[PDB]
């Protein structure tokens, strides 16, 4: 592909969550071959964000997978065009997110126009009060779903107390280009950490790895 082994990413991201309405800018770099990627984000409106920034952080693009070559990478061959995704982020306590990014590229540079709603969560739930400490590495189930490149995940957040909190996504990936060859059933293996933070999360250091794999036994 004629996506560069070191590439910049810019980021816009508008939300509104319980009814709190923010804007957050990131900025960041990635190496789409290896999987890695980290962003600067920082709060541009809204903040100090009356919730947990983990809800957000999958919100900050599925170029970047470290791909077999025997794998079918949609991602980059969405490019240079590019693709978007939808997601719905289902709480086990009845929260909802939905979330959308438009990804496009001019030349060495990945931009993101990222909408984000989040709705139901409880007033004394984790996420409003700001009782989450990280996603637990997961693995992307990815599939076609009436041909839609579809990814569903069991994800985890860890809480405060030594308990979790469970939330679903379900997210669709169409590319720009139409005939687009879309893959064969695949894995993706996802590690997201917040690197570093202030206080009230006004700036934060983002960084996650994947890899894809065909499942067992191919690893
Ligand atoms: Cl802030
Ligand atoms: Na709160």
């Known amino acids: 592909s004629a996506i560069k082994p070191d590439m910049r990413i810019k980021l816009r991201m508008e939300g509104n969550v319980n009814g709190h309405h923010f804007v957050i800018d990131g900025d960041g770099t990635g190496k789409p071959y290896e999987g890695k990627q980290t962003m600067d984000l920082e709060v541009k409106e809204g903040g100090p964000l009356p919730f947990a920034f983990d809800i957000l952080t999958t919100a900050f693009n599925r170029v970047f997978v470290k791909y077999p070559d025997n794998i079918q990478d949609y991602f980059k061959q969405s490019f240079p065009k590019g693709y978007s995704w939808e997601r719905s982020l289902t709480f086990e306590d009845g929260g909802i997110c939905n979330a959308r990014n438009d990804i496009t590229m001019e030349g060495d540079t990945f931009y993101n126009k ?7 969560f409880p007033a004394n739930g984790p996420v409003m009060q700001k009782k989450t400490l990280k996603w637990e590495p997961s693995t992307e189930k990815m599939y076609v779903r009436d041909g839609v490149l579809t990814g569903d995940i ?4 860890l809480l405060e107390g030594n308990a979790h909190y469970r939330c679903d996504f379900r997210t669709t990936y169409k590319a720009k280009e139409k005939g687009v060859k879309l893959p064969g059933a695949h894995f993706v293996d996802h590690a997201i950490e917040i690197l570093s933070h202030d206080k009230d999360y006004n700036k934060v250091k983002l960084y996650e790895h994947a890899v894809a794999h065909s499942g067992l036994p191919d690893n």
């Open 114 to 120: 990222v909408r984000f709603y989040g709705t139901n």
């Open 154 to 157: 069991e994800m985890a957040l």
